[PDB]
Design a protein around this nucleic acid. Structure first.
Lengths: 110, 56, 117, 103, 142
RNA sequence: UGUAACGGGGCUAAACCAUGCACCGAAGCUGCGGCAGCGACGCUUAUGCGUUGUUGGGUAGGGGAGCGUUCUGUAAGCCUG
RNA sequence: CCCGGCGAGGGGAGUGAAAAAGAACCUGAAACCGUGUACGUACAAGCAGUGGGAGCACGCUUAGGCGUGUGACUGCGUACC
């Protein structure tokens, strides 16, 4: 049993989410429930909501148990950016590039 | 000044060990609380010394 | 009608960047840096074509002079005394017994003294 | 037997059943040849002759492969007084297996 | 083409020592560099070193006395700007007899990482006593 | 500025003179095997391969010998799900 | 229809040859972001490369002398329109 779930156009920069991705990836497949609820920064609570939705999409698909599952892949890709403007002295302006990301998680019983 | 070349992927060294943190070794389990709690400290349902001392 | 350059599009950048493998940083990504590094790689392969020969002599003589000085004589006096004998020399390519056989070397030093005073 | 001989102005060492690459011999595969310019010969002991070349010596060989060799690139450059002209460079080989060595 | 080459890797050493009594500090170091590189025992050289250990034990017993002994300069930069030290051959044998050859032989070892690999074998002693009394260094003779 | 007026180790020869042979020394000169042209030849063909003579730095510039693109005709064709 | 904040986004369900054609709606190499397995590797001096080549994997074949990748060791090495 394998479930793959993605969350797209998410309101965070992909590189900032890729800091928490390496803390959850690998490490004897034992970082979810171990530190995921207790990890700092706004990126960690985003990937936790995606992971708890991915295992709920496994219970939607087959049977009543999900206790054999672990995370096997966790990656994040760059969403389509928005060129905004904010004026300055004269001006002149700030670039204020607004960004998004696409998060993908895989959960498996193997 | 600007980055004239992309660094060898090892040079993030002592930032890479801080890029995501719990900053604690390693949080404790309690018999009447769901989420784990800090050493010498209160749980997310108000338990301290095995007894409930505050309400949420 | 127009030619639109499709006959050669991307093909010049390919021809250099396929030769840019393993080169450090910009040399394996930036065609202007890679082209310059490939002409310099061509210079060193051109110099090998015109310098390689020298290192074969440097193997031959180094084993002769060391073994001849272990026999009490200099290479310059050995090779001259061996040419003074007429023939029996087999050229500098075959002096390898200086690191492969003791008896064949002492018999070659005896031949390098046969015609001397 | 182990021998050394002259072929195409180049010297070659051969033991029975060994193979050597010469320059262009137009007769191609399966044809046989015989060489007489043998310099030294041995049975594990060399004849150690006090003269150039072996009397009555012959080496027997058969063609096993032939043709034009792999191309070498030759280019003539100069900086700031500009030229870059290319010269073509290909040569020919014939690969022959030794069937016998006698003297 | 890739025509195979036979690479040795295994080595065992029996330990030798050379006498400095009545010899010049210049040519003693030139002969010691030649013996460390192995060009008295092994051929080609500097490549594929299969040699044996060769050291000095009586390095203080070198020659030249009563004239040209209060001589030479041995200039050295300490690492503190223009800060420089100087010596004489008399002072060097009187208080630095193991180091005066050590600072001069490294300048005649092979270039690159092989220089360090030969320098690690040098191990010079003075006063006729070493830390190798169970190895044990025997006299190098012709 | 920091050895600072043998490259450097170091040196009464390893300094300096001229003298004799050896040795290392380039793509030079020669040999061996080829390339590109041309005067003269030899052996031979889905036609070129050897032999000999003779030459082979080149930007400014002059003058030649080939490769390639797209389009109209050939195309009332040919390739094609 | 499922999770979620009757959010947003995905994930099922239904249509199609194909929705990796699903609204930002056909096709498409890259600079920037990022992958796992093999191979080498934890003191080291210079335009960052080049010729030879042990070891190992990968490929194939009497494995037997030669392909795809990496790389110990080693001769050569102060950018350019």
């Amino acid at each position: 049993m394998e479930t793959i779930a993605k969350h797209r156009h998410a309101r965070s920069s992909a590189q900032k989410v890729r800091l928490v991705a390496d803390l959850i990836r690998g490490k004897k497949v034992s970082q979810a429930l171990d530190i995921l609820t207790y990890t700092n920064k706004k990126a960690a609570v985003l990937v936790k909501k995606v992971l708890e939705s991915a295992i709920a999409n496994a219970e939607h698909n087959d049977g009543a148990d999900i206790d054999d599952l672990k995370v096997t892949k966790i990656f994040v890709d760059e969403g389509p950016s928005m060129k905004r403007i904010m004026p300055r002295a004269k001006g002149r302006a700030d670039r204020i590039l607004k960004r998004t990301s696409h998060i993908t998680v895989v959960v498996s019983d193997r | 000044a600007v980055q004239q070349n992309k660094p060898t992927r090892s040079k993030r060294g002592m930032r890479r060990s801080h890029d995501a943190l719990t900053a604690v070794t390693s949080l404790s389990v309690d018999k009447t609380s769901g989420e784990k709690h800090l050493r010498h400290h209160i749980t997310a349902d108000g338990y301290y010394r095995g007894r409930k001392v505050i309400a949420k | 009608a127009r030619v639109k350059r499709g006959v050669i599009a991307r093909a010049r950048h390919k021809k250099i960047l396929k030769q840019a493998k393993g080169y450090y940083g910009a040399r394996s990504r930036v065609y202007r840096v890679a082209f310059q590094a490939v002409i310099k790689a061509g210079q060193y392969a051109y110099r090998d074509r015109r310098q390689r020969k020298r290192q074969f002599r440097q193997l031959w003589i180094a084993r002769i002079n060391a073994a001849a000085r272990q026999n009490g004589i200099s290479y310059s006096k050995f090779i001259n005394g061996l040419k003074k004998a007429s023939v029996e020399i087999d050229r500098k390519i075959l002096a390898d017994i200086a690191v492969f056989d003791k008896v064949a070397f002492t018999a070659l030093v005896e031949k390098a003294k046969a015609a001397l005073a | 037997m182990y021998a050394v001989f002259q072929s195409g102005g180049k010297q070659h060492r051969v033991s029975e059943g060994q193979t050597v690459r010469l320059e262009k011999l137009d007769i191609a595969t399966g044809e046989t040849v015989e060489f007489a310019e043998v310099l030294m010969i041995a049975n594990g002991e060399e004849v150690k002759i006090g003269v150039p070349f072996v009397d009555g010596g012959v080496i027997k060989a058969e063609v096993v492969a032939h043709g034009r060799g792999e191309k070498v690139k030759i280019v003539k450059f100069r900086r700031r007084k500009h030229y870059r002209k290319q010269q073509g460079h290909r040569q020919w080989f014939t690969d022959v297996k030794i069937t016998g060595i006698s003297a | 083409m890739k025509t195979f080459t036979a690479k040795p890797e295994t080595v065992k050493r029996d330990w030798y020592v050379v006498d400095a009594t009545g010899k010049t500090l210049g040519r003693l170091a030139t002969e010691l560099a030649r013996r460390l590189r192995g060009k008295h025992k092994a051929e080609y050289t500097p490549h594929v070193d299969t040699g044996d250990y060769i050291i000095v034990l009586n390095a203080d017993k070198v020659a030249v006395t009563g004239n040209k002994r209060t001589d030479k300069v041995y200039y050295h930069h300490t690492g503190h700007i223009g800060g420089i030290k100087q010596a004489t051959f008399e002072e060097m044998i009187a208080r630095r007899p193991e180091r005066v050859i050590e600072i001069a032989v490294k300048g005649m070892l092979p270039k690159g990482p092989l220089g360090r690999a030969m320098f690690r074998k040098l191990k010079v002693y003075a006063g006729n006593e070493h830390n190798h009394a169970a190895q044990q260094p025997q006299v190098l003779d012709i």
